[PDB]
Amino acid sequence: TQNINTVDMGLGYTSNTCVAYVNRVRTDMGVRVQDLFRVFPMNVYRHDEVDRWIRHAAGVERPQLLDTETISMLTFGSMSERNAAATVHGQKAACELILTPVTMDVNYFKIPNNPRGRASCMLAVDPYDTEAATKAIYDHREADAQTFAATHNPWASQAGCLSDVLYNTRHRERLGYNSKFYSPCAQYFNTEEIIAANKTLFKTIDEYLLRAKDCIRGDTDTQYVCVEGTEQLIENPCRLTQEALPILSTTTLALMETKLKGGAGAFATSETHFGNYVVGEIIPLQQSMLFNS
Amino acid sequence: DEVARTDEWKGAGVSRLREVWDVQHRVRLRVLWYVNSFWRSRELSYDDHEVELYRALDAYRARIAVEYVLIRAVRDEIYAVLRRDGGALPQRFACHVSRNMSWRVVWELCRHALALWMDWADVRSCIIKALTPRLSRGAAAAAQRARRQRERSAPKPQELLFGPRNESGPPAEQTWYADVVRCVRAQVDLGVEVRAARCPRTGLWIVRDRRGRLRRWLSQPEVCVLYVTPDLDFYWVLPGGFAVSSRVTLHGLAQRALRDRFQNFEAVLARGMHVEAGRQEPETPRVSGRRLPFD
Amino acid sequence: FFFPVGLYLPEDRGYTTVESKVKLNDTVRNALPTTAYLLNRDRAVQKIDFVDALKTLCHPVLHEPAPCLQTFTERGPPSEPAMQRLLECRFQQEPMGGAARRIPHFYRVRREVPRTVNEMKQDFVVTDFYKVGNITLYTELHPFFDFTHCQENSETVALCTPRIVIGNLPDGLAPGPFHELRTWEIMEHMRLRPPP
Amino acid sequence: MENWSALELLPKVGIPTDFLTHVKTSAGEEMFEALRIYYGDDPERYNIH
Amino acid sequence: MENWSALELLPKVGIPTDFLTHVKTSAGEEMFEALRIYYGDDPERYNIH
Amino acid sequence: METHLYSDLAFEARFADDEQLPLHLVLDQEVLSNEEAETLRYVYYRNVDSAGRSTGRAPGGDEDDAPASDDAEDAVGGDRAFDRERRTWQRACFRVLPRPLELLDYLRQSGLTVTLEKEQRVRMFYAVFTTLGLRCPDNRLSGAQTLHLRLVWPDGSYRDWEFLARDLLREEMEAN
Amino acid sequence: MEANIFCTFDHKLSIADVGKLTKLVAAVVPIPQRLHLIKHYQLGLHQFVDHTRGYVRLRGLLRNMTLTLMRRVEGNQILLHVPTHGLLYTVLNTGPVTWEKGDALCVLPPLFHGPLARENLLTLGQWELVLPWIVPMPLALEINQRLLIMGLFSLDRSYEEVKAAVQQLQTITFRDATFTIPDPVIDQHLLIDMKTACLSMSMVANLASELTMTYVRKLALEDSSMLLVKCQELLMRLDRERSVGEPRTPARPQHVSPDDEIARLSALFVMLRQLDDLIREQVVFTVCDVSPDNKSATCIFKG
Amino acid sequence: ANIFCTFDHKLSIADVGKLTKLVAAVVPIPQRLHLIKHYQLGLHQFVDHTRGYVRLRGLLRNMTLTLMRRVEGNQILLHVPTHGLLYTVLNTGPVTWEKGDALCVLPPLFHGRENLLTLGQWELVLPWIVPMPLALEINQRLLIMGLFSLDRSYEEVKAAVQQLQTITFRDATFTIPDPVIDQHLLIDMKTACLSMSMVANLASELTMTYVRKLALEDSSMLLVKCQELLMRLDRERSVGEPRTPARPQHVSPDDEIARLSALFVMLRQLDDLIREQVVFTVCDVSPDNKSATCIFKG
Amino acid sequence: VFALMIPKDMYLTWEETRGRLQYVYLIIVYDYDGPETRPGIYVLTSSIAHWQTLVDVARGKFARERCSFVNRRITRPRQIPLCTGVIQKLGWCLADDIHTSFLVHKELKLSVVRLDNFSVELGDFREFV
Amino acid sequence: TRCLLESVYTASAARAALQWLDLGPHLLHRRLETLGCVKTVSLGITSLLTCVMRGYLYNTLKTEVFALMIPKDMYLTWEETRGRLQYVYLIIVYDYD
Structure with missing residues (x-):
């Protein structure tokens, strides 16, 4: 054994990194939906016949009892969802769904935004100002900082929403859930963590470097929360900026065919045809960057 | 080998299923009869002589009347004291008034309000809610302690200089229950909780919402309010703060009837309760149909 | 990444900029979108429909509004003076015995009644429903359920009630033209595209 | 928590x-732990004990 | 508090x-203001830090 | 259904002293709400004779028969009267079935055999099974006897109803 | 198998903190899992401590945890040693209980001691190191017995009558020291324990033969002594509460049968062992040495 | 771990020769200590006419066990065995061991006085190491024989105790001493019998009330079975009496507390009796069978 | 040290997310519901090492057999039942070490469960009601 | 705060001061005379305090300057942005209930 001590000899940041090159996607970039019956195994419908009928109509099986406190102490989180028979496209990027009104502004999806419908970046709020932070993220009588509307999704933006009780980890703990499953929504709906993250500039940079990092098991078909060792943490810039990026999506196969037929730079532009539309990818990821390598 | 009672209970089964309503026909429930109950083997006799049923119905009538006789006592006390003082009543709640107002119409509205309150008063009126804590066991000892504190002699210099703190008096803010009757659209709100405090500049009463906001129905001409204090003093207040004051006598009822009608329940130790008294309870032990049972 | 599926674009302002590039044959299935198309890890085409969401949508948690009501009631009624008009409704059961005869007696008194919050939602247009001027937004918590504050026993209480049919959604979140287009879709499904 | 007087004197x-x-x-943005600021001349460095 | 290990080493x-x-x-009858008693051999003095 | 069997055995064991016979009841959405059924804590019952006198009090009357006195210091015969009043209530066992069921089908799913004069099905959102004791000291029981049912919830609130023996027993006693 | 376990403190340690740690060497610290590397958050009972939740829950959680001995604080690292069965170790007692040579020790959640001061061990921000009490067998047995008795007595009673009896039951006096059981609550664990006790008592009542039932009555008629007087007080109060019957003399034995008695007594002993398991904790140390200041002892570790 | 024992009496060569035959015997010590006197060897310390089998069993529980190693001219060397290792031990019991037996330690019921090492009113008495079934059988035979003590006037009970004294164990027969002397029972055995009778009597009374208390919380089928069993027990027990057993409901708190505490304190007395201490496991036994190799389970 | 072989029918586990360290037990349970008695034999793997908690969860699992034991006691008064069941601990192994395997001997093919690096620490036949 | 600093001054002399203050018929300010601010203490059965009545507060070598401590309930300001130089006053106001 040999132990090492390091002293930093700079008064400022004396080292820099850049993400220079990428060549793989570990996940499938798919469209498969998250299985809530896995994450919430205890719940059943009150009438047994309708419970059987609903579980048969979907692809899910019988409910399961969450393990007790002593067992949870002795063991690790349950990996309820088995691996698949074959894995061609790699790890499953499970999509989590937020219910929105049909009249929600389509231009909202064409730029990086909070899927919650309201801005919640703490770098805009004064440090350690808890009341200002809560008013910023929750008060719908105060105009949203990003768009100056009250919200673009009333069913997700305010305290006690459907999506708030679905994805906020406090409400999940209230309901009883399997914590082993990774949730892509948790970073946006975790109000208490976001409020606590409201520090000064360099403190937030240090938090971003050290702690506010995702960690997902890389050896299983479904995204499980990692054990905090033997797996290195994953940088997640969206955690700091509190936004999601827009992906290339289209409403009809005609517009997808047009995008595939066009030359370079076709994926970037967004187009509309009466009731149909395309949203262009914010960075040329799909078109060039994955396939250049 | 012998046969267990449970096996013969199961095999014998039931043969009855009957619906029974309560006396006032509010609630219906079903009764099961098991052909293996020990009830069968007894030599039981049964008879329903008419005079016994008549007496039972009279006693049941007496049981119901306990609340309404008390309400009528409050009403006739109101009329008695109003006659006693010749219809002249003083301001007792803080409100500003004008000499130019036509007070005859508000007198008429007060009469209408009295009629409407007597029409609508119920078991959930402020009177019953105010007297119910009196029936609790700690009540008598607390009253004795309060009286003994209230009339003790002034401290001498020795006890002020040496020894214990001064004995604290009662808090300035009290909790009352009230019945609010509105005439313009017939509406009576029974058993509303209110906080009462006495104004410093003038010794009148000020009533506030339990959240602390000022109750404003003194300013509304169409509403009269009846207040009852835990000392069983009642004020019948018409707008402007002018009130009729008297005490809620209840010696017209036997102790047994009042007590067995609405003495408060007291709990016994069960699952989830702390063995020590007064501790913070954990979550309530619900049994639910939304979830799988814990076993 | 985040992407929408199922949005309805305003027909009163519809436009196209790709008329010279694509043509869709006149069907309702083209008119009202239900599908979103994406690219795979390879540049292959993949598809999502509402049927695939059933693993999420059918779970009881979406249909249970108890935590929503708990949050709604734990934070009290709004204190802003402009918002007080939302709290003034009171609802009263009363016997049906003499109702027909008593109907004139109700109008006998010439007093107006407070306007219910659900009715107030209906007069916002589709675009300014989301603006800060929409007072009622603090009640629009769940798509499937209704919320309001009301006066009960001279106190303010919170009432939660389920929307039984989709027609009960506010006009700002599901306008009339959307319902008409959806009916056209159902008729096209039933082969009634030109109706009798 | 740090001995600022020792830093000033040594x-x-x-x-x-x-x-x-x-x-x-x-x-102001908290680049460092253990910060101290003072204005003008602060005499506290002179009282050794 | 008094560090007895320094007395033990120096x-x-x-x-x-x-x-x-x-x-x-x-x-035992508490004659001394501060007191430390240990039996056998106490390894405390060996972990200099 | 285990509650009914246990209560029958318990009342059989206690009959010599108590002279109370068991009465098995089923409760559903016609008597209590789903929340009330899910959160129920205790069920209590009281026996009242034809004269309106509760069982637990003295036969020849009590001090409680005196009028109340309006004195706060006296309360209403406070501690002694409170003790006398509490003494008259008795606690019964109960079990809650929190999910919709058909009663006859449920009973047949258990070991019981069911043979009714008319086999009409009864459907209920939930069921509370409880057994109450009816007092018959003389080995006689009068149709004018009254029985009270009390349900208590964790906050201490309660709901009361009363039934008279005629409605409970008219044809059942005439059959035996 | 992992013998030595590394624990990393995620918080910067001052000189006072490392002084406290080097003072704490050879104490007994419980761990939730026998991992190779753990964070300091997992140390001790603080991760589980919760008032308004009760004593029995914490007792069960502690009983499931694994025990380690502390050594070698070496600059933001501490090394925990998992003892092996049958070997000889030195143990530090951190509680107020008085150890004596030759007795067996059990691990239990801390009780409330008289001076009310308690005082903290290391305190890293909101985290605090709280250790269990290593206690001799008689005291642990008394605690479990009184907890069960309190549970059985309290059910179906009002707070008023249980107040004085519970205040009396909670207080323990052991070797000139006074302790109180801090937070008893009627819980699922206590209820299943009570159910098992009730079943065992019913089987004991069913199994007991006529002569083992009547032995006490025969002695009461034949002999007189203070112990017998104390027993007869209880039995007489029970009989008088039941009926006005005077003490009946027993009869001539009807069916003498050694084999029947032997089988019946064997069954009774099975039931008695089952009833005893409810209160007897697991022995973890047997002491044979003690410092005269009662600060440490030499003990043999038992699994 | 080594323990040194010294003799301050005056040994002869005959005494040494008698002592060397016990080279692998099991010797109990009151406490672990580096250097002890010969007075503290064996059970001779505790023997007195007023106490018997129960007290010696209880004392043997807390004692520490040692094996012997051969002798200096005046000093005995004792070895404290560690758990899990294997050692050679001497068969001092009245029966023969065999492979796989679990061995318990018991106070000696009888001797032979053949080879007692006596040094001025002190003598070395060693406990019996016997297989677990034999220990169980003789323990419960003694306990039963204690209960019969109070009415031994009848002939049938005398025949019962006569049958109860004799024991046969795989081709060995011997007679257990009668725990009653001069029509009286020693105090420790009397307290044991009193405690077990009190436990039974208290259980018979308290069980019904606690069944009711628990059934109020939940009414599982197990409580129904317990209720039926207790009703049967009361019916059979009351067959010789009129009317009813008439158990009441309004029990005073102090009576209930006293009854529960008495039940448990009586349970604590028996805990030494209900369990046998098993500390050895014999792997290999010599054909001579007077010695064997065993694994220490202490 | 060695490896332990267990047939598929005799294996059961109650926790579905196996802890890193697994203790194994031998459990036999008597069912008295029939005219004879049916002793069910099982081999159990669990992360619980404390015997009392394992007994409590086992009682929770096998309640029907407890009721059957009491029913056997009441039904046949002249006969004394043994117990509800006994539990003995023998072994500890890691979760990854557990595998499913097939065995062929005497031409018969059997499905078996193996604990690849089993360590033997045999406890005691302890009975529970 | 009243409860806290009433528990602090649980001495015969302080209670005597309070009784003397409330005893007479005069207004409070007629009974009071202000001396200044204190900066020293020598403890004993009778303690000695040294108080300045014109000047700054500092120790022997001026190596440390002392502040003036006002309990938070008694502190009062009437301006949003403070002037560079501030004067401080003592106010006693009577409510005639």
Whole structure:
């Protein structure tokens, strides 16, 4: 054994990194939906016949009892969802769904935004100002900082929403859930963590470097929360900026065919045809960057 | 080998299923009869002589009347004291008034309000809610302690200089229950909780919402309010703060009837309760149909 | 990444900029979108429909509004003076015995009644429903359920009630033209595209 | 928590400093643990015990 | 609090001690302001930090 | 259904002293709400004779028969009267079935055999099974006897109803 | 198998903190899992401590945890040693209980001691190191017995009558020291324990033969002594509460049968062992040495 | 771990020769200590006319066990065995061991006085190491024989105790001493019998009330079975009496507390009796069978 | 040390997310519901090492057999039932070490469960009601 | 705060001061005379305090300057942005209930 001590000899940041090159996607970039019956195994419908009928109509099986406190102490989180028979496209990027009104502004999806419908970046709020932070993220009588509307999704933006009780980890703990499953929504709906993250500039940079990092098991078909060792943490810039990026999506196969037929730079532009539309990818990821390598 | 009672209970089964309503026909429930109950083997006799049923119905009538006789006592006390003082009543709640107002119409509205309150008063009126804590066991000892504190002699210099703190008096803010009757659209709100405090500049009463906001129905001409204090003093207040004051006598009822009608329940130790008294309870032990049972 | 599926674009302002590039044959299935198309890890085409969401949508948690009501009631009624008009409704059961005869007696008194919050939602247009001027937004918590504050026993209480049919959604979140287009879709499904 | 008086009294080695941002911005934004600021002349360094 | 390990390590002056009563009696009857007693061999003095 | 069997055995064991016979009941959405059924804590019952006198009090009357006195210091015969009043209530066992069921089908799913004069099905959102004791000291029981049912919830609130023996027993006693 | 376990403190340690740690060497610290590397958050009972939740829950959680001995604080690292069965170790007692040579020790959640001061061990921000009490067998047995008795007595009673009896039951006096059981609550664990006790008592009542039932009555008729007087007080109060019957003399034995008695007594002993398991904790140390200041002892570790 | 024992009496060569035959015997010590006197060997310390089997069993529980190693001219060397290792031990019991037996330690019921090492009113008495079934059988035989003590006037009970004294164990027969002397029972055995009778009597009374208390919380089928069993027990027990057993409901708190505490304190007395201490496991036994190799389970 | 072989029918586990360290037990349970008695034999793997908690969860699992034991006691008064069941601990192994395997001997093919690096620490036949 | 600093002054002399203050018929300010601010203490059965009545507050070598401590309930300001130089006053106001 040999132990090492390091002293930093700079008064400022004396080292820099850049993400220079990428060549793989570990996940499938798919469209498969998250299985809530896995994450919430205890719940059943009150009438047994309708419970059987609903579980048969979907692809899910019988409910399961969450393990007790002593067992949870002795063991690790349950990996309820088995691996698949074959894995061609790699790890499953499970999509989590937020219910929105049909009249929600389509231009909202064409730029990086909070899927919650309201801005919640703490770098805009004064440090350690808890009341200002809560008013910023929750008060719908105060105009949203990003768009100056009250919200673009009333069913997700305010305290006690459907999506708030679905994805906020406090409400999940209230309901009883399997914590082993990774949730892509948790970073946006975790109000208490976001409020606590409201520090000064360099403190937030240090938090971003050290702690506010995702960690997902890389050896299983479904995204499980990692054990905090033997797996290195994953940088997640969206955690700091509190936004999601827009992906290339289209409403009809005609517009997808047009995008595939066009030359370079076709994926970037967004187009509309009466009731149909395309949203262009914010960075040329799909078109060039994955396939250049 | 012998046969267990449970096996013969199961095999014998039931043969009855009957619906029974309560006396006032509010609630219906079903009764099961098991052909293996020990009830069968007894030599039981049964008879329903008419005079016994008549007496039972009279006693049941007496049981119901306990609340309404008390309400009528409050009403006739109101009329008695109003006659006693010749219809002249003083301001007792803080409100500003004008000499130019036509007070005859508000007198008429007060009469209408009295009629409407007597029409609508119920078991959930402020009177019953105010007297119910009196029936609790700690009540008598607390009253004795309060009286003994209230009339003790002034401290001498020795006890002020040496020894214990001064004995604290009662808090300035009290909790009352009230019945609010509105005439313009017939509406009576029974058993509303209110906080009462006495104004410093003038010794009148000020009533506030339990959240602390000022109750404003003194300013509304169409509403009269009846207040009852835990000392069983009642004020019948018409707008402007002018009130009729008297005490809620209840010696017209036997102790047994009042007590067995609405003495408060007291709990016994069960699952989830702390063995020590007064501790913070954990979550309530619900049994639910939304979830799988814990076993 | 985040992407929408199922949005309805305003027909009163519809436009196209790709008329010279694509043509869709006149069907309702083209008119009202239900599908979103994406690219795979390879540049292959993949598809999502509402049927695939059933693993999420059918779970009881979406249909249970108890935590929503708990949050709604734990934070009290709004204190802003402009918002007080939302709290003034009171609802009263009363016997049906003499109702027909008593109907004139109700109008006998010439007093107006407070306007219910659900009715107030209906007069916002589709675009300014989301603006800060929409007072009622603090009640629009769940798509499937209704919320309001009301006066009960001279106190303010919170009432939660389920929307039984989709027609009960506010006009700002599901306008009339959307319902008409959806009916056209159902008729096209039933082969009634030109109706009798 | 640190002995600032010992820092003030003891001899020091002079270096050219290279804060990227303004030094007061680095202090106000909490670049360092164990910060102390004072204005003018603070006599507390003179009371040795 | 007094760090007894420093006394245990540093050089000491040899003295003929004179307690009128038994040492454990004077210590047990609380003659001394601060006191530390240990039995056997205490490894504490060896972990210099 | 285990509650009914246990209560029958318990009343059989206690009959010599108590002279109370068991009465098995089923409760559903016609008597209590789903929340009330899910959160129920205790069920209590009281026996009242034809004269309106509760069982637990003295046969020849009590001090409680005196009128109340309006004195706060006296309360209403406070501690002694409170003790006398509490003494008259008795606690019964109960079990809650929190999910919709058909009663006859449920009973047949258990070991019981069911043979009714008319086999009409009864459907209920939930069921509370409880057994109450009816007092018959003389080995006689009068149709004018009254029985009270009390349900208590964790906050201490309660709901009361009363039934008279005629409605409970008219044809059942005439059959035996 | 992992013998030595590394624990990393995620918080910067001062000089006072490392002084406290090096003072704490050879104490007994419980761990939730026998991992190779753990964070300091997992140390001790603080991760589980919760008032308004009760004593029995914490007792069960502690009983499931694994025990380690502390050594070698080495600059932001501490090394925990998992003892092996049958070997000889030195143990530090951190509680107020008085150890004596030759007795067996059990691990239990801390009780409330008289001076009310308690005082903290290391305190890293909101985290605090709280250790269990290593206690001799008689005291642990008394605690479990009184907890069960309190549970059985309290059910179906009002707070008023249980107040004085519970205040009396909670207080323990052991070797000139006074302790109180801090937070008893009627819980699922206590209820299943009570159910098992009730089943065992019913089987004991069913199994007991006529002569083992009548032995006490025969002695009461034949002999007189203070112990017998104390027993007869209880039995007489029970009989008088039941009926006005005077003490009946027993009869001539009807069916003498050694084999029947032997089988019946064997069954009774099975039931008695089952009833005894409810209160007897697991022995973890047997002491044979003690420092005269009662600060440490030499003990043999038992699994 | 080594323990040194010294003799301050005056040994002869005959005494040494008698002592060397016990080279692998099991010797109990009151406490672990580096250097002890010969007075503290064996059970001779505790023997007195007023106490018997129960007290010696209880004392043997807390004692520490040692094996012997051969002798200096005046000093005995004792070895404290560690758990899990294997050692050679001497068969001092009245029966023969065999492979796989679990061995318990018991106070000696009888001797032979053949080879007692006596040094001025002190003598070395060693406990019996016997297989677990034999220990169980003789323990419960003694306990039963204690209960019969109070009415031994009848002939049938005398025949019962006569049958109860004799024991046969795989081709060995011997007679257990009668725990009653001069029509009286020693105090420790009397307290044991009193405690077990009190436990039974208290259980018979308290069980019904606690069944009701628990059934109020939940009414599982197990409580129904317990209720039926207790009703049967009361019916059979009351067959010789009129009317009813008439158990009441309004029990005073102090009576209930006293009854529960008495039940448990009586349970604590028996805990030494209900369990046998098993500390050895014999792997290999010599054909001579007077010695064997065993694994220490202490 | 060695490896332990268990047939598929005799294996059961109650926790579905196996802890890193697994203790194994031998459990036999008597069912008295029939005219004879049916002793069910099982081999159990669990992360619980404390015997009392394992007994409590086992009682929770096998309640029907407890009721059957009491019913056997009441039904046949002249006969004394043994117990509800006994539990003995023998072994500890890691979760990854557990595998499913097939065995062929005497031409018969059997499905078996193996604990690849089993360590033997045999406890005691302890009975529970 | 009243409860806290009433528990602090649980001495015969302080209670005597309070009784003397409330006893007479005069207004409070007629009974009071202000001396200044204190900066020293020598403890004993009778303690000695040294108080300045014109000047700054500092120790022997002026190596430390002392502040003036006002309890938070008694502190009062009437301006949003403070002037560079501030004067401080003592106010006693009577409510005639």
